Symmetry: D2
């Protein structure tokens, strides 16, 4: 258990990749705090069945108010967040001539602001303790030619810039900041369909002390399609 006595936060952790990472971290000894719009009964039962503590909060991660309240709550309950996984995000297909400023803005609020708001809430606790991990979810579409995702790819690129820049800011405090880039769901080197479990090993590795000298990096886990 590489994450023993650690409290990990996963946004959008009620389902999909978010939940997969949450459980993997729990398996590795970490207690869990999930922030999402919908309830996470499944994740909660699986995590508790592992003997781990878990808290689920209904929250709109794009709203400063909800994130501040979520942060206070997580701090009151577990006292501190050691690992922050910014997984929350939307990816609607929208042709450029139909893309409105409102849709564009909404995409940034959910995909980018949430990671910033969450960092503001938990970095202080990490700095005080001299150890921390922040993992941002980006996308391989960042390196691919694909239409109707101008708003989406712009935010995913922002996630990488956020990762690199924040890593520079927090590197002296024992905190690493990295990103994981899954495919958006032949062109891959490994002819296998991607599944959430394919990303849990990388997340666990990055959140462990086996990667303490690794920060500001983006690790693509996609069967070898993109190269960077």
């Amino acid at each position: 258990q590489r994450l023993k006595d650690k409290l990990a936060v996963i946004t959008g952790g009620a389902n999909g990749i978010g939940r997969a990472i949450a459980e993997r971290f729990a398996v590795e000894g970490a207690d869990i705090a999930i922030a999402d719009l919908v309830p996470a009964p499944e994740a909660e039962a699986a995590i508790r069945n592992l003997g781990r503590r878990v808290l689920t909060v209904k929250c709109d991660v794009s709203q400063p108010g909800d994130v501040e309240a979520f942060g206070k709550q997580v701090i009151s309950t577990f006292g501190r967040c050691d690992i922050l996984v910014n997984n929350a995000g939307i990816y609607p297909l929208i042709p450029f001539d139909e893309l409105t400023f409102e849709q564009w803005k909404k995409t940034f609020e959910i995909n980018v602001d949430s990671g910033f708001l969450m960092a503001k809430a938990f970095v202080p606790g990490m700095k005080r303790n001299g150890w921390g991990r922040i993992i941002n979810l980006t996308s391989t579409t960042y390196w691919l030619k694909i239409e109707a995702y101008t708003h989406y790819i712009s935010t995913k690129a922002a996630n990488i810039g956020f990762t690199r820049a924040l890593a520079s800011d927090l590197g002296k405090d024992g905190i690493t900041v990295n990103a994981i880039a899954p495919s958006l769901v032949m062109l891959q080197a490994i002819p296998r369909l991607q599944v959430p479990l394919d990303l849990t090993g990388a997340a666990a590795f990055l959140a462990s002390d086996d990667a303490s000298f690794i920060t500001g990096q983006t690790l693509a886990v996609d069967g070898g399609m993109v190269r960077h």
Copy 2:
């Protein structure tokens, strides 16, 4: 005259790199339209000295209303915009601990929303004429370890995402979308400081027929410091 009979819009073109690019484009034969919060007397004089037309409009490129008005004025005055240079942007140094959500948002509104708003205003005209050029200014800090620029580097990264994704959406309309990455102003291969004129060649190149098959790319002009 690689830019003969074309109207180029340069946001934040009153000074610095924006101004240098505007004048070079004029030298190449293009009429100019500048969007900025301040007047551009020096720029106008240089452009008119080249026998080219110029229009400078007081405009807050981050505000939908201003951009929409700016767009109608440009179309009414020149009929169309063939080249859009999204150069406008702010880059204040702000340590993460000091960085607020308001400053974070403001940085995105100026550095990222502007490019989207301008594209929405001028892409229709380019598509109709079957030719267009959009050049986004980003920053080499995107690949550098430098503190106090989490907000800034996140937008600079978004600019690249925007470049790559929009390039894919408009590639079939005869419009190319590229980005130029100047350094922020020993580590360089070329031992001398960067000056505005070092970037004009690349901009004129990307805006001409010599680069009609180049799109979605990011060109670094920094004396050989970053490599990507």
Copy 3:
């Protein structure tokens, strides 16, 4: 023990990073085969102390004859090779105006040909077993402005192309091919302290495990956050 019942080959494993990776792999439960110019008594003792099998062979990894002989010996001795770490390499500083074709050629033979020769020797066995891991050591100097390394950086870039192209070739065989980029032996890093061999071992073990079965053709920089790519 994620590497239990695995035979891992480490080139240039008698010292430094090579030796460190070999020992960590042994800790993970794998047996070890070392190819190097000099003997590896220290590494062998540490590996045996962990209760693992270890073989060291005098070998110039740039010579096809040597590598071929090394391959046969490893296969005979362990039955197979599941993990190949192409660590071997040199990095002499040589100003361009002083760099000769002989030196340039020598740098490629050791730094690039070794990895190719080692792959030709162990890939068949991996393909047959339907599982394999190849890890190539490159360098962050690949993304850095630094003089007197035109030969070195050229080979380090080649290591990456090799990594990417071979990953494509073997993607259907259950074999992944990735690279690790350490800094070349403070204020320029996000993490201030100096890099130590142990900083790379965690990354090597991860890539060699099932935790990275869907990861291939990638280059992982472990340098305290200096380079970004």
Copy 4:
């Protein structure tokens, strides 16, 4: 006439992209020196028709003797070499299990050594005069998942490393070193149409001109917007 009174050398300039670059440089005012295994009658005609001087030398760019002799002849003929375009190279499709060390080696000798040998030949003069442009041709396959090109992609990656490292070595001497990555020749590109030699000339002329004095160590992909780096 951005290249007015310059002497440019283009390896493999008898046909395809090489020739296209040669003719464009001639259009921009430069005299031409071509190194290739075959004659360039079509190229020589067009260039002389542009009012420019041209020299074509039967030459195997992978051999030190040939290159050294080519350099002396170019300097002896024009008294200078301001621009070097390392365009020569081969790209045979070869599955990994069939790729031999000999094939691997030959691919490096032609695709990589040639660039080095030409630099040693012309860099001294560029440095002495304090102005120079070196342009290396690489390939977008460097960033693409594609099989049977392990040898090829490894050399194309070497070209980028060479470009980056040499740029650092020559940056203080008024010399820039950059690379152009054309696609190896529809819906995979942002601009659907097929790539043609002319698509690369604009970038070649740009980099070799004074419009790119502050650009060095970079790789410019010209492929219709397929790859992104």
